[PDB]
Design a binder for this molecule. Structure first.
Ligand SMILES: Cc1ccc(C[C@H](CO)Nc2ncnc3[nH]ccc23)cc1C
Ligand SMILES: [Cl-]
Length: 167
């Protein structure tokens, strides 16, 4: 039993809700919140911009030190950093950005990172400003993630389409 509330159950392990991941994380304080990261961990907009703003830029400061030491992530890759005031940990995951021409097949590799964590709060990878079809992203999530994932969808209209169209 966990403290996530108001989710619709899609499969044994995947759940979904129309919610603001920033507000969800502050309420639940999950063990792991997933960020929709880029390889440079530059959290300028989208989910990453919102999560970083909620940390008062501490996420960006930590991320800049990470990159200075380790260099950029891979598309499809991830790193574990602090969750600051939002969660114990933040799993920064790089889904392909279609608006950069990045291969959408890497979306499965991106979701595989979730399997290293028993329970996660997450957005749909490569959705929003990353340009992928959220219906495809949800399908890949369900077919790739085996651990317990609580998916937060900010937009109410989009959530209804994902649910009504879920096979
Ligand atoms: C119009 C529109 C907006 C957003 C999305 C999803 C992306 C992630 O898939 N953004 C987010 N998802 C969850 N919480 C969030 N908080 C801040 C940003 C954000 C899709 C579409 C079509
Ligand atoms: Cl977004």
């Amino acid at each position: 039993v966990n403290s996530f509330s108001g989710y619709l159950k899609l499969t044994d392990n995947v759940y979904i809700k129309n919610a603001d991941i920033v507000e969800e994380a502050k309420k639940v304080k999950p063990t792991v919140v997933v960020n929709a990261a880029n390889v440079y961990l530059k959290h300028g907009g989208g989910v990453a911009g919102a999560l970083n703003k909620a940390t008062n830029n501490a996420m960006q400061v930590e991320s800049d030190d990470y990159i200075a030491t380790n260099g950029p992530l891979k598309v499809g890759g991830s790193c574990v950093l602090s969750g600051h005031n939002l969660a114990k940990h933040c799993l920064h995951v790089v889904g392909p950005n279609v608006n950069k021409g990045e291969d959408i097949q890497l979306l499965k590799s991106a979701y595989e990172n979730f399997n290293q964590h028993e329970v996660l709060l997450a957005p749909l990878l490569s959705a929003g400003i990353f340009g992928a079809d959220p219906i495809h992203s949800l399908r890949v999530c369900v077919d790739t993630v085996r651990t317990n994932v609580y998916l937060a969808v900010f937009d109410k209209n989009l959530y209804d389409k994902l649910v009504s169209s879920f096979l």
